């Protein structure tokens, strides 16, 4: 057998990036999105609206965030 | 008075204690000044006017 040519064709690129790199970067990019969303969760936890929507819907750790001091003792 | 609730007295007790003092309210339709019983936002009054 003798090969006089190449069986090769140019892939898809935009100069800086190509899909060769992005098909390998995509699972770690989704993991970085998950890590950044967890960082947003921990840095915006003292927020009361996010506290009552998400951070009290957590099953076991949820009711530890509530302090139900009675309405007989609050100035406002 | 609002710092006093939840510390030494309750909210009803401080609201009943704040009524015994009079405070300067902004004047009414005619212009002459009025007095009002105190609410929880006003400060504890001193015994001497100056
Ligand atoms: C944008 C910033 C808005 C800040 C704000 O809107 O602030 C409102 C809350 C106040 O929360 P609090 O329960 O301390 O006060 C309630 C009354 N005692 O800020 C926070 O603590 C949570 C935000 C912290 C991190 C936000 C910055 C990163 C995004």
UniProtKB/Swiss-Prot annotation, chain A:
Major localization class: mitochondrion
GO terms, biological process: aerobic respiration; cellular respiration; mitochondrial electron transport, ubiquinol to cytochrome c; proton transmembrane transport
UniProt xrefs under InterPro entries: Cytochrome_b-c1_su10_fun
Keywords of this entry: Electron transport, Membrane, Mitochondrion, Mitochondrion inner membrane, Respiratory chain, Transmembrane, Transmembrane helix, Transport
Location of the protein in the cell: Mitochondrion inner membrane
Ranges of the Mitochondrial intermembrane topological domain: 45-76
Any one Gene Ontology cellular component term annotated for this protein: respiratory chain complex III
Entry coiled-coil feature ranges: none
Keyword Plastid found: no
Recorded topology in the membrane: Single-pass membrane protein
Mitochondrial matrix side: 1-20
Transmembrane segments: 21-44
UniProt superkingdom: Eukaryota
Role, per record: Component of the ubiquinol-cytochrome c oxidoreductase, a multisubunit transmembrane complex that is part of the mitochondrial electron transport chain which drives oxidative phosphorylation.
Subunit structure: Component of the ubiquinol-cytochrome c oxidoreductase (cytochrome b-c1 complex, complex III, CIII), a multisubunit enzyme composed of 10 subunits. The complex is composed of 3 respiratory subunits cytochrome b (COB), cytochrome c1 (CYT1) and Rieske protein (RIP1), 2 core protein subunits COR1 and QCR2, and 5 low-molecular weight protein subunits QCR6, QCR7, QCR8, QCR9 and QCR10.
Note: Present with 5590 molecules/cell in log phase SD medium.
Protein family: Belongs to the UQCR11/QCR10 family.
Protein name (Swiss-Prot/TrEMBL): Cytochrome b-c1 complex subunit 10, mitochondrial
Swiss-Prot record, chain B:
Stretches the record annotates as Disordered: 20-50
Subcellular locations according to the entry: Mitochondrion inner membrane
Compositional bias segments (type: Acidic residues): 20-29
Miscellaneous comment as given in the Swiss-Prot or TrEMBL entry: Present with 39900 molecules/cell in log phase SD medium.
Assembly and binders: Component of the ubiquinol-cytochrome c oxidoreductase (cytochrome b-c1 complex, complex III, CIII), a multisubunit enzyme composed of 10 subunits. The complex is composed of 3 respiratory subunits cytochrome b (COB), cytochrome c1 (CYT1) and Rieske protein (RIP1), 2 core protein subunits COR1 and QCR2, and 5 low-molecular weight protein subunits QCR6, QCR7, QCR8, QCR9 and QCR10.
Function, in words: Component of the ubiquinol-cytochrome c oxidoreductase, a multisubunit transmembrane complex that is part of the mitochondrial electron transport chain which drives oxidative phosphorylation.
Record-stated family: Belongs to the cytochrome c family.
UniProt name for this protein: Cytochrome c1, heme protein, mitochondrial
